[PDB]
Design an enzyme around this catalytic site. Structure first.
Site, PDB file in Angstrom:
ATOM      1  N   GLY A  85       0.822  -1.190   0.000  1.00  0.00           N
ATOM      2  CA  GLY A  85       0.000   0.000   0.000  1.00  0.00           C
ATOM      3  C   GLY A  85       0.863   1.250   0.000  1.00  0.00           C
ATOM      4  O   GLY A  85       2.081   1.208   0.165  1.00  0.00           O
ATOM      5  N   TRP A  86       0.203   2.398  -0.197  1.00  0.00           N
ATOM      6  CA  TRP A  86       0.936   3.653  -0.375  1.00  0.00           C
ATOM      7  C   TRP A  86       1.818   3.983   0.829  1.00  0.00           C
ATOM      8  O   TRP A  86       3.018   4.256   0.677  1.00  0.00           O
ATOM      9  CB  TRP A  86      -0.043   4.797  -0.633  1.00  0.00           C
ATOM     10  N   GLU A 128       4.294   0.376  -4.104  1.00  0.00           N
ATOM     11  CA  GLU A 128       4.064   1.563  -4.924  1.00  0.00           C
ATOM     12  C   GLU A 128       5.289   2.479  -4.834  1.00  0.00           C
ATOM     13  O   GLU A 128       5.306   3.396  -4.018  1.00  0.00           O
ATOM     14  CB  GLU A 128       2.756   2.272  -4.471  1.00  0.00           C
ATOM     15  N   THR A 197      -5.991   1.742 -12.691  1.00  0.00           N
ATOM     16  CA  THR A 197      -6.400   2.725 -13.699  1.00  0.00           C
ATOM     17  C   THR A 197      -7.250   3.828 -13.059  1.00  0.00           C
ATOM     18  O   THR A 197      -8.403   4.072 -13.422  1.00  0.00           O
ATOM     19  CB  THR A 197      -7.138   2.029 -14.838  1.00  0.00           C
TER      20      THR A 197
HETATM   21  N1  LIG Z   1      -4.758   1.679  14.230  1.00  0.00           N
HETATM   22  C1  LIG Z   1      -5.672   2.352  13.248  1.00  0.00           C
HETATM   23  C2  LIG Z   1      -5.006   2.525  11.916  1.00  0.00           C
HETATM   24  O1  LIG Z   1      -4.982   1.210  11.301  1.00  0.00           O
HETATM   25  C3  LIG Z   1      -5.628   3.504  10.934  1.00  0.00           C
HETATM   26  O2  LIG Z   1      -4.572   3.917  10.013  1.00  0.00           O
HETATM   27  C4  LIG Z   1      -4.868   3.961   8.583  1.00  0.00           C
HETATM   28  O3  LIG Z   1      -3.975   3.101   7.691  1.00  0.00           O
HETATM   29  C5  LIG Z   1      -4.290   3.238   6.247  1.00  0.00           C
HETATM   30  C6  LIG Z   1      -3.307   2.437   5.442  1.00  0.00           C
HETATM   31  O4  LIG Z   1      -2.013   2.913   5.695  1.00  0.00           O
HETATM   32  C7  LIG Z   1      -4.313   4.692   5.752  1.00  0.00           C
HETATM   33  O5  LIG Z   1      -4.794   4.786   4.393  1.00  0.00           O
HETATM   34  C8  LIG Z   1      -3.969   5.596   3.533  1.00  0.00           C
HETATM   35  O6  LIG Z   1      -4.241   7.053   3.691  1.00  0.00           O
HETATM   36  C9  LIG Z   1      -3.469   7.924   2.796  1.00  0.00           C
HETATM   37  C10 LIG Z   1      -4.077   9.289   2.897  1.00  0.00           C
HETATM   38  O7  LIG Z   1      -3.715   9.806   4.144  1.00  0.00           O
HETATM   39  C11 LIG Z   1      -3.464   7.485   1.328  1.00  0.00           C
HETATM   40  O8  LIG Z   1      -2.370   8.215   0.765  1.00  0.00           O
HETATM   41  C12 LIG Z   1      -2.571   8.572  -0.608  1.00  0.00           C
HETATM   42  O9  LIG Z   1      -2.339   7.424  -1.525  1.00  0.00           O
HETATM   43  C13 LIG Z   1      -2.490   7.786  -2.930  1.00  0.00           C
HETATM   44  C14 LIG Z   1      -2.267   6.537  -3.718  1.00  0.00           C
HETATM   45  O10 LIG Z   1      -3.018   5.510  -3.117  1.00  0.00           O
HETATM   46  C15 LIG Z   1      -1.501   8.889  -3.318  1.00  0.00           C
HETATM   47  O11 LIG Z   1      -1.791   9.203  -4.688  1.00  0.00           O
HETATM   48  C16 LIG Z   1      -0.578   9.487  -5.397  1.00  0.00           C
HETATM   49  O12 LIG Z   1      -0.172  10.886  -5.095  1.00  0.00           O
HETATM   50  C17 LIG Z   1       1.093  11.251  -5.744  1.00  0.00           C
HETATM   51  C18 LIG Z   1       1.378  12.687  -5.415  1.00  0.00           C
HETATM   52  O13 LIG Z   1       1.246  12.836  -4.023  1.00  0.00           O
HETATM   53  C19 LIG Z   1       1.069  11.033  -7.257  1.00  0.00           C
HETATM   54  O14 LIG Z   1       2.442  11.140  -7.639  1.00  0.00           O
HETATM   55  C20 LIG Z   1       2.680  12.123  -8.653  1.00  0.00           C
HETATM   56  O15 LIG Z   1       2.180  11.654  -9.968  1.00  0.00           O
HETATM   57  C21 LIG Z   1       2.353  12.672 -11.002  1.00  0.00           C
HETATM   58  C22 LIG Z   1       1.834  12.068 -12.266  1.00  0.00           C
HETATM   59  O16 LIG Z   1       0.558  11.552 -11.989  1.00  0.00           O
HETATM   60  C23 LIG Z   1       3.820  13.067 -11.151  1.00  0.00           C
HETATM   61  O17 LIG Z   1       3.850  14.202 -12.020  1.00  0.00           O
HETATM   62  C24 LIG Z   1       4.773  13.908 -13.087  1.00  0.00           C
HETATM   63  O18 LIG Z   1       6.168  14.208 -12.636  1.00  0.00           O
HETATM   64  C25 LIG Z   1       7.055  14.016 -13.780  1.00  0.00           C
HETATM   65  C26 LIG Z   1       8.472  13.942 -13.298  1.00  0.00           C
HETATM   66  O19 LIG Z   1       8.687  14.922 -12.316  1.00  0.00           O
HETATM   67  C27 LIG Z   1       6.845  15.189 -14.735  1.00  0.00           C
HETATM   68  O20 LIG Z   1       7.690  14.995 -15.874  1.00  0.00           O
HETATM   69  C28 LIG Z   1       8.452  16.181 -16.166  1.00  0.00           C
HETATM   70  O21 LIG Z   1       7.565  17.316 -16.593  1.00  0.00           O
HETATM   71  C29 LIG Z   1       8.262  18.475 -17.175  1.00  0.00           C
HETATM   72  C30 LIG Z   1       7.216  19.278 -17.889  1.00  0.00           C
HETATM   73  O22 LIG Z   1       5.994  18.588 -17.812  1.00  0.00           O
HETATM   74  C31 LIG Z   1       9.366  18.106 -18.175  1.00  0.00           C
HETATM   75  O23 LIG Z   1      10.157  19.272 -18.423  1.00  0.00           O
HETATM   76  C32 LIG Z   1      10.265  17.006 -17.685  1.00  0.00           C
HETATM   77  O24 LIG Z   1      11.140  16.587 -18.773  1.00  0.00           O
HETATM   78  C33 LIG Z   1       9.498  15.825 -17.215  1.00  0.00           C
HETATM   79  N2  LIG Z   1      10.448  14.829 -16.625  1.00  0.00           N
HETATM   80  C34 LIG Z   1       5.417  15.281 -15.208  1.00  0.00           C
HETATM   81  O25 LIG Z   1       5.081  16.684 -15.422  1.00  0.00           O
HETATM   82  C35 LIG Z   1       4.350  14.675 -14.345  1.00  0.00           C
HETATM   83  N3  LIG Z   1       3.580  13.710 -15.200  1.00  0.00           N
HETATM   84  C36 LIG Z   1       4.430  13.444  -9.830  1.00  0.00           C
HETATM   85  O26 LIG Z   1       5.869  13.574  -9.999  1.00  0.00           O
HETATM   86  C37 LIG Z   1       4.166  12.441  -8.758  1.00  0.00           C
HETATM   87  N4  LIG Z   1       4.686  12.956  -7.446  1.00  0.00           N
HETATM   88  C38 LIG Z   1       0.559   9.656  -7.584  1.00  0.00           C
HETATM   89  O27 LIG Z   1       0.397   9.527  -9.025  1.00  0.00           O
HETATM   90  C39 LIG Z   1      -0.719   9.297  -6.898  1.00  0.00           C
HETATM   91  N5  LIG Z   1      -1.001   7.852  -7.164  1.00  0.00           N
HETATM   92  C40 LIG Z   1      -1.721  10.072  -2.407  1.00  0.00           C
HETATM   93  O28 LIG Z   1      -0.758  11.137  -2.645  1.00  0.00           O
HETATM   94  C41 LIG Z   1      -1.643   9.722  -0.961  1.00  0.00           C
HETATM   95  N6  LIG Z   1      -2.010  10.909  -0.123  1.00  0.00           N
HETATM   96  C42 LIG Z   1      -3.271   6.000   1.186  1.00  0.00           C
HETATM   97  O29 LIG Z   1      -3.591   5.601  -0.180  1.00  0.00           O
HETATM   98  C43 LIG Z   1      -4.178   5.217   2.079  1.00  0.00           C
HETATM   99  N7  LIG Z   1      -3.957   3.744   1.912  1.00  0.00           N
HETATM  100  C44 LIG Z   1      -5.251   5.443   6.639  1.00  0.00           C
HETATM  101  O30 LIG Z   1      -5.352   6.831   6.210  1.00  0.00           O
HETATM  102  C45 LIG Z   1      -4.780   5.385   8.042  1.00  0.00           C
HETATM  103  N8  LIG Z   1      -5.566   6.385   8.826  1.00  0.00           N
HETATM  104  C46 LIG Z   1      -6.251   4.720  11.668  1.00  0.00           C
HETATM  105  C47 LIG Z   1      -7.394   5.350  10.946  1.00  0.00           C
HETATM  106  O31 LIG Z   1      -8.048   6.147  11.910  1.00  0.00           O
HETATM  107  O32 LIG Z   1      -6.937   4.425  12.937  1.00  0.00           O
HETATM  108  C48 LIG Z   1      -6.091   3.655  13.891  1.00  0.00           C
HETATM  109  O33 LIG Z   1      -6.825   3.376  15.006  1.00  0.00           O
END
Ligand SMILES: N[C@@H]1[C@@H](O)[C@H](O[C@@H]2O[C@H](CO)[C@@H](O[C@@H]3O[C@H](CO)[C@@H](O[C@@H]4O[C@H](CO)[C@@H](O[C@@H]5O[C@H](CO)[C@@H](O[C@@H]6O[C@H](CO)[C@@H](O[C@@H]7O[C@H](CO)[C@@H](O[C@@H]8O[C@H](CO)[C@@H](O)[C@H](O)[C@H]8N)[C@H](O)[C@H]7N)[C@H](O)[C@H]6N)[C@H](O)[C@H]5N)[C@H](O)[C@H]4N)[C@H](O)[C@H]3N)[C@H](O)[C@H]2N)[C@@H](CO)O[C@H]1O
Ligand SMILES: *[C@@H]1O[C@H](CO)[C@@H](O[C@@H]2O[C@H](CO)[C@@H](O)[C@H](O)[C@H]2NC(C)=O)[C@H](O)[C@H]1NC(C)=O
Length: 377
Positions: A85-86, A128, A197
């Site tokens: 997971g994340w 991931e 997806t």
């Molecule tokens: N005891 C009890 C406990 O059990 C309980 O605790 C709980 O536990 C669970 C499980 O752990 C918890 O659940 C989790 O909660 C979290 C939220 O708090 C969730 O977190 C999220 O997860 C999702 C995925 O699942 C994340 O989503 C991702 O987010 C990231 C960003 O943050 C995305 O990443 C980005 O993607 C883009 C593209 O899509 C990319 O952009 C590209 O970058 C490139 C390169 O840099 C670029 O390319 C360049 O561009 C320029 C010009 O364009 C050019 O010049 C260059 O040449 C070229 N190289 C381009 O522009 C872009 N295309 C980014 O870089 C990249 N960073 C990602 O895609 C996406 N999937 C999300 O962020 C998370 N927040 C998690 O999923 C859950 N499982 C629970 O919360 C927890 N509480 C507790 C509960 O109470 O209780 C206790 O008692």
């Protein structure tokens, strides 16, 4: 029934959905056994000793959650345990494991014993991601690709003779797919590949966009950020259609837009959307939170008449993109048209299982099941 069909419907279960107030509470016995062929338990995690371990002992063990989900084998459903997971994929611990053959060898024997102790039918890998740790491809070594492929081989070699399943949830992003996955090795050894997806867009883009577009839209920054491209790319890289299950989101990505006056696609965004009462995560809303906003709080819905993507909805400076029943039917017809292995949902607890929105219990998941069972394409 789904079990007698040619398709899988892989349902992710999440143990943390228990810790929600009121009607958002979800327990193992809320699983509807008519709606899944496979249930995947999210998550176990990687311990500091390099061994799979329970994420939440209070639920998983003390309240017998593992056993209460493995219960569903009695219906003929296959119940796997997901590792990762994340949050667990932060940092280098999975990379350290897969780059160390001695550590992999230790991990594999313990992991199979762990599955057999609790009666799981298999293991689902949700790292991931190899190489691109949390989608930062600058972070991990190229050798994560071979290391993951060898981990999959070594797990398969122990699981398959015992009749146990091995699957993985995988990136939809071209760059990550290219860097992290030895696709032919994974396609050959895995029983299915759950392509995630969704999460193509979200608050991190700094502008509005759809969580899970199906087809290219003329204003997209790229031709790659849609399910159609992603699924065809997995096949081009060597994956058989029968090994693919296509993920569909039971939730939306939410956004705080910079100015309430424009509310279309690709408009500037200052933050994630305000957290929902039940899921309590900025930028995220469960379908049952979204449909209530539309039904009872006057959110305005915009649909795509060409059905390249599902709807978005907005009110004030709040904006959310998500899948409705209409686009889900279109996506499942897409699954059938490509003869894919089936569909996957993230996650059981986010659909309107309580019928809070009066569209029936589990409106999204029932839409998937009905369309999967419909012979016409
Ligand atoms: N005891 C009890 C406990 O059990 C309980 O605790 C709980 O536990 C669970 C499980 O752990 C918890 O659940 C989790 O909660 C979290 C939220 O708090 C969730 O977190 C999220 O997860 C999702 C995925 O699942 C994340 O989503 C991702 O987010 C990231 C960003 O943050 C995305 O990443 C980005 O993607 C883009 C593209 O899509 C990319 O952009 C590209 O970058 C490139 C390169 O840099 C670029 O390319 C360049 O561009 C320029 C010009 O364009 C050019 O010049 C260059 O040449 C070229 N190289 C381009 O522009 C872009 N295309 C980014 O870089 C990249 N960073 C990602 O895609 C996406 N999937 C999300 O962020 C998370 N927040 C998690 O999923 C859950 N499982 C629970 O919360 C927890 N509480 C507790 C509960 O109470 O209780 C206790 O008692
Ligand atoms: C679905 O995605 C596929 C593949 O990415 C698209 O089919 C491609 O069509 C484009 C037109 O530029 C060509 O680049 C490729 O020659 C095609 N490949 C194949 C295998 O046909 C298809 O156009 C996409 N569908 C929609 C509806 O957008």
């Amino acid at each position: 029934s789904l079990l007698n069909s040619r398709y899988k419907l892989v349902c992710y279960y999440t143990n943390w959905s228990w810790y929600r107030p009121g009607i958002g509470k979800y327990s193992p016995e809320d699983i509807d056994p008519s709606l899944c062929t496979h249930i995947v338990y999210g998550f176990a995690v990687l311990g500091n000793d390099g061994l799979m371990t329970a994420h939440d002992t209070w639920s998983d063990y003390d309240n017998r959650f593992y056993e209460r989900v493995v219960e569903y084998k009695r219906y003929g459903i296959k119940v796997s345990l997901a590792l990762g997971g994340w949050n667990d994929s932060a940092g280098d611990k999975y990379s350290k494991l897969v780059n160390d053959p001695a550590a992999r060898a230790k991990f594999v024997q313990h992991a199979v014993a762990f599955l057999e102790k609790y009666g799981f039918d298999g293991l689902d890998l949700d790292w991931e991601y190899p190489k691109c740790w949390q989608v930062d491809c600058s972070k991990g070594p190229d050798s994560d690709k071979q290391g993951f492929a060898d981990l999959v081989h070594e797990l398969s070699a122990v699981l398959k003779p015992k009749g146990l399943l091995l699957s993985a949830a995988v990136s939809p992003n071209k760059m990550v797919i290219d860097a992290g996955y030895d696709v032919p090795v994974l396609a050959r050894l895995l029983d299915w590949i759950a392509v995630m997806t969704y999460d193509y867009h979200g608050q991190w883009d700094k502008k509005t966009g759809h969580v899970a577009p199906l087809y290219y839209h003329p204003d997209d920054d790229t031709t790659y950020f849609n399910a159609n491209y992603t699924i065809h790319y997995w096949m081009e890289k060597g994956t058989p259609a029968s090994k693919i299950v296509m993920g569909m989101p039971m939730y939306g990505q939410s956004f705080t837009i910079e100015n309430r006056g424009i509310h279309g696609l690709n408009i500037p965004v200052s933050d994630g959307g305000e957290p929902g009462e039940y899921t309590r995560a900025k930028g995220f809303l469960a379908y049952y939170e979204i449909c209530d906003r539309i039904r009872n709080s006057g959110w305005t819905v915009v649909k795509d008449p060409y059905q390249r993507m599902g709807p978005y909805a907005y009110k004030g400076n709040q904006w959310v993109s998500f899948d409705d029943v209409e686009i889900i039917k279109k996506k499942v017809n897409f699954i059938k048209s490509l003869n894919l292995g089936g569909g996957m949902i993230w996650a059981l607890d986010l659909d309107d299982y309580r019928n809070r929105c009066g569209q029936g219990k589990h409106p999204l998941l029932n839409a998937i099941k009905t369309e999967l069972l419909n012979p016409k394409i």
